[PDB]
Structure formats: structure tokens, C-alpha cells
Amino acid sequence: MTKIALLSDIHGNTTALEAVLADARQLGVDEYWLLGDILMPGTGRRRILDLLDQLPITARVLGNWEDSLWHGVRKELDSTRPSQRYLLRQCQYVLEEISLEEIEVLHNQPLQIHRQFGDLTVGISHHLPDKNWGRELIHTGKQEEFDRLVTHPPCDIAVYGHIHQQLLRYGTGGQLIVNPGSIGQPFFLDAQLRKDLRAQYMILEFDDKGLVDMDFRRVDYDVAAELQLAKDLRLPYFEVYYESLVNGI
Amino acid sequence: MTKIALLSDIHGNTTALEAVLADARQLGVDEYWLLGDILMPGTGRRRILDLLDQLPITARVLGNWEDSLWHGVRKELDSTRPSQRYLLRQCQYVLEEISLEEIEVLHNQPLQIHRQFGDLTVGISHHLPDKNWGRELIHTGKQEEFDRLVTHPPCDIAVYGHIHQQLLRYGTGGQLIVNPGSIGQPFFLDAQLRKDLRAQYMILEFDDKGLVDMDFRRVDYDVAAELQLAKDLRLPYFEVYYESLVNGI
Ligand SMILES: [Fe+3]
Ligand SMILES: [Fe+3]
Ligand SMILES: [Mn+2]
Ligand SMILES: [Mn+2]
Numbered sequence: 024m025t026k027i028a029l030l031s032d033i034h035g036n037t038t039a040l041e042a043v044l045a046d047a048r049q050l051g052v053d054e055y056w057l058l059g060d061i062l063m064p065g066t067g068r069r070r071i072l073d074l075l076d077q078l079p080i081t082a083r084v085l086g087n088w089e090d091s092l093w094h095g096v097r098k099e100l101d102s103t104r105p106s107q108r109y110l111l112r113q114c115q116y117v118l119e120e121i122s123l124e125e126i127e128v129l130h131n132q133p134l135q136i137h138r139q140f141g142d143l144t145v146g147i148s149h150h151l152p153d154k155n156w157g158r159e160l161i162h163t164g165k166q167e168e169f170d171r172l173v174t175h176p177p178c179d180i181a182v183y184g185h186i187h188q189q190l191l192r193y194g195t196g197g198q199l200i201v202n203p204g205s206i207g208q209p210f211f212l213d214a215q216l217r218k219d220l221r222a223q224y225m226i227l228e229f230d231d232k233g234l235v236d237m238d239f240r241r242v243d244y245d246v247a248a249e250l251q252l253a254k255d256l257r258l259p260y261f262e263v264y265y266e267s268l269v270n271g272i
Numbered sequence: 273m274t275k276i277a278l279l280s281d282i283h284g285n286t287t288a289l290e291a292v293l294a295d296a297r298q299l300g301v302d303e304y305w306l307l308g309d310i311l312m313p314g315t316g317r318r319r320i321l322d323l324l325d326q327l328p329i330t331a332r333v334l335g336n337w338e339d340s341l342w343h344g345v346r347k348e349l350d351s352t353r354p355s356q357r358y359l360l361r362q363c364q365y366v367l368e369e370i371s372l373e374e375i376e377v378l379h380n381q382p383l384q385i386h387r388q389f390g391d392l393t394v395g396i397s398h399h400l401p402d403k404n405w406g407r408e409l410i411h412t413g414k415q416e417e418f419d420r421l422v423t424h425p426p427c428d429i430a431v432y433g434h435i436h437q438q439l440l441r442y443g444t445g446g447q448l449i450v451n452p453g454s455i456g457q458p459f460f461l462d463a464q465l466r467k468d469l470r471a472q473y474m475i476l477e478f479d480d481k482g483l484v485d486m487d488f489r490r491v492d493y494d495v496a497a498e499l500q501l502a503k504d505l506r507l508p509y510f511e512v513y514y515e516s517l518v519n520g521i
Binding site: 241 | 429437470486490
């Protein structure tokens with residue numbers, strides 16, 4: 024048996040990431056797949072990169088926030104738009120601890136990977152195979168779009184992140200489509216589910232006979248500590264980060 | 273923390289059910305939810321009822337196959353229709369061990385119930401709330417139909433069975449929709465995943481903070497022993513049962 028932890032949409036959430044990695048370590052996880060959206064708009068910088076450096080990371084794909092960071096530091100974002108100015112402040116925040124050379128490394132990642140596990144082809148991407156941004160694959164996404172994860176090129180199991188929701192569904196051909204959700208910014212549209220903003224990730228176990236387990240986990244972390252950390256660090260847009268971690272909007 | 277095993281679509285697969293019950297016991301499962309399709313076309317009769325009756329079953333709903341066994345033992349089937357001929361033979365097989373008192377108990381079950389875990393409302397049915405049969409809720413089903421599980425009446429998490437596939441997806445309103453797949457007749461349209469016909473079930477974990485785990489498990493069982501059991505007991509339509517357990521079509 025190989026036990027793989029899927030890690031997605033960390034978003035600089037230091038305390039939530041530490042808690043998930045402790046959980047994963049306890050469970051005897053063998054390897055880690057990284058689905059992107061690593062840094063921003065959360066607290067962690069050097070800390071996130073160092074935590075990940077310690078891991079047996081055997082697959083990594085490019086998230087749209089890594090592009091954003093890259094464009095942000097190169098001064099390639101539109102200063103007219105408020106949403107972009109918000110991004111600029113996050114990029115500048117990140118730059119205080121992270122070198123341009125490291126941002127180059129984060130940016131130089133494939134959109135899509137494929138691994139073989141015995142009989143099974145596994146596709147891996149942040150969002151779509153050739154597009155790491157957008158809303159094609161939200162919870163009500165068109166089947167045409169989901170099938171893009173599992174055909175041309177084909178796989179039997181696609182894993183993706185980006186939407187910040189846990190998922191197990193199917194391509195038209197019965198190919199598995201899974202999403203670990205988000206470590207740092209779990210997204211809920213149901214108000215009761217939204218009261219529980221513990222971190223999200225998932226574990227895949229492959230054995231001699233195929234896929235033996237798909238475990239969608241929630242991990243408790245200390246929100247107060249993460250928020251205090253944000254205050255101490257002078258994280259930009261504290262009020263937004265507070266809403267996301269406390270209220271989930 | 274309360275740990276709940278979702279058991280569905282057993283279809284009289286004695287060996288697969290026994291392995292699933294052993295697995296669940298080892299994990300320290302606290303309650304069992306029986307989603308229906310209990311007996312036929314597989315081997316188990318008395319033994320399956322004996323097993324179930326040892327369980328703390330805290331939720332139970334009616335599957336279409338419980339209806340089929342009812343009409344079947346009431347002499348309402350016409351064997352000039354191949355579909356019904358097959359069903360009647362399965363019913364006769366079942367009738368060598370199972371009394372009409374027991375079939376009545378199997379038949380006297382609600383289509384849809386609800387359970388509450390703190391803030392969360394969970395809906396339970398075999399298929400649709402008012403209809404334990406059909407193809408509305410297949411892997412390519414319409415969003416309108418999935419919404420039937422979570423609205424009118426409302427719940428935050430719907431669980432259903434019937435389609436013989438593991439599932440985690442969403443109501444339009446972000447409500448969760450989960451399916452443990454099938455214990456005795458797992459179903460795959462992807463030929464690589466079809467090479468692995470281990471029993472499907474799933475575990476839900478609820479704690480003080482809400483839903484903390486969704487574990488979609490596969491459990492190995494002795495296929496040769498269940499086919500040897502089928503031969504020994506003179507199970508009707510052996511090659512159809514063989515084909516489902518070995519090839520998955
Ligand atoms: Fe993200
Ligand atoms: Fe069934
Ligand atoms: Mn993203
Ligand atoms: Mn059914």
C-alpha cells in the first residue's frame with residue numbers, strides 16, 4: 024500500500040497547514056501531491072515553503088495564485104482595479120520573505136501531470152488540464168467541462184483542487200474525479216456546513232488490487248492563533264482574512 | 273464522535289457483506305445505516321438477516337428490490353417477460369429459507385427518513401425521496417433531480433444508494449450528497465476501475481463540530497468462495513452472478 028495525501032489551496036494558512044501535516048504524519052502518509060494555491064492571502068511565507076520542503080512531494084501542479092504572485096512581483100498587475108491592488112499588496116507582503124528566484128520556482132510548474140498506479144492512469148491538475156483559473160468545474164459545472172479532466176488526454180482518476188470543496192464524482196465514461204478541498208479556505212454554500220471551517224484534504228490509498236480508499240478529511244486548527252499571527256505579522260487586509268477563516272465568505 | 277457505516281446494495285452477497293461487517297467492527301463503528309437492496313440475486317438468505325440483526329441499525333430505508341421480492345412472493349410476476357422470469361426464480365430461491373413474516377418486515381420500511389447531528393440535518397433514501405427505482409440519480413443525472421434529495425424536505429447532507437457507485441457531490445445550495453456504493457455488486461463504467469470489484473461502502477464521522485470524516489472504503493472478500501457457495505446452494509442464473517462478481521457487467 025501507498026498512502027497519498029492530497030494538499031490543495033493552502034493559501035498561506037500557516038496554522039491550518041501545520042495541523043494537516045501533523046494529521047498526515049500521524050496517519051503514516053507515504054507521499055504528498057501538491058495541487059497549487061500555496062501562498063496568499065494568508066500568513067505563511069518562508070514557513071510554508073520550509074514545511075513543504077520537509078515533505079516527500081512526488082507531484083506538483085501550477086495553481087492560478089502562483090501565476091498571480093509571479094505577475095504581482097514583475098509589476099504586471101492592473102493598478103486600476105481594486106481586486107488587483109489587493110493582490111499587489113499580498114505579493115509585496117510575500118516578497119519580504121521570499122526571493123524572486125523562489126517565486127520563479129513556484130511559477131515553473133506543469134499545469135497537468137499523469138501517473139500510473141498498476142492498471143490506473145491518474146491525471147493531476149489545479150483546475151482544468153490547460154487552464155488553472157475560472158469556474159468551469161464548480162459544484163454545478165457542466166459535464167462537458169468535467170470530461171475535459173479525464174479525456175484528451177485520458178485518465179481513470181482525475182484529481183483537482185481550486186474550488187475549495189471536497190468531491191467524488193464521474194466523467195461520462197465512469198472515470199473518477201476527486202477534489203481534496205482546501206486546507207486554508209474551505210468553501211461552503213450550505214450555512215450549517217459553513218459553521219465548520221476546519222481544514223480540508225484527502226487521502227488516496229493504492230494497493231496491489233487498485234484504489235482501496237478515498238478518505239476526505241477535516242482537520243481542526245487553532246483559528247485564534249492564526250488570526251493573532253496575522254495581526255503580529257501585519258498581514259494586509261486582516262478584515263478579509265478574518266471573514267474567510269471565521270465566517271467563510 | 274459518532275462513527276456510522278453506510279451499508280447499501282448488498283444483493284444477497286453473503287461473503288462481501290461478512291467482510292464489510294468484519295472491517296466495520298474493527299474500525300469501531302457505532303451505528304449502521306441500511307440503504308436497501310438487501311436480498312437477491314446473490315446467495316444469502318437466513319445468514320444475511322442473522323448478520324443484520326446483530327447490528328445496531330439506527331436508520332433503514334426501502335430499496336426497490338425489497339418491493340420486487342414482495343410482488344414476487346405474491347405471485348404477480350409474469351415469466352413470459354424475461355425480466356420477471358429471472359426475478360421470480362430469485363424469489364423462489366429466497367423462499368426456501370425466508371418466511372412471509374420476514375418478507376413483510378423487509379417490505380415495511382420508509383422510503384425517506386431524517387436524522388439530526390447537532391446543527392446538521394441528514395436525509396436518507398434508497399434513491400429519490402418518493403421513488404426507490406429508476407435512473408434519475410445516475411452519475412450523469414440532472415442537477416434538478418439531485419436537488420430533490422436535499423430540498424422539499426430540506427437537509428444538509430443526503431445519503432442514497434441504488435446506483436452502485438461511491439459519490440460525494442452537491443445540491444445547488446451546497447448541500448452534500450453522498451453514496452456508499454454497493455456492498456455486493458459494485459458498478460463501474462471505466463474498464464480499469466472495473467478490474468477491482470471489491471465491496472464498496474462508506475463511513476461518516478460526526479463530532480461536536482460537525483461532519484469530520486467521509487471515508488469511501490473498498491473491502492476485499494473471497495470471490496471464489498462466494499461462487500462456490502452459489503454452486504453449492506443451487507443459486508439460479510449462476511453465470512449472470514459469476515459475471516457480475518468477476519467482470520462487473
Ligand atoms: Fe485556491
Ligand atoms: Fe441495488
Ligand atoms: Mn485556484
Ligand atoms: Mn436499487
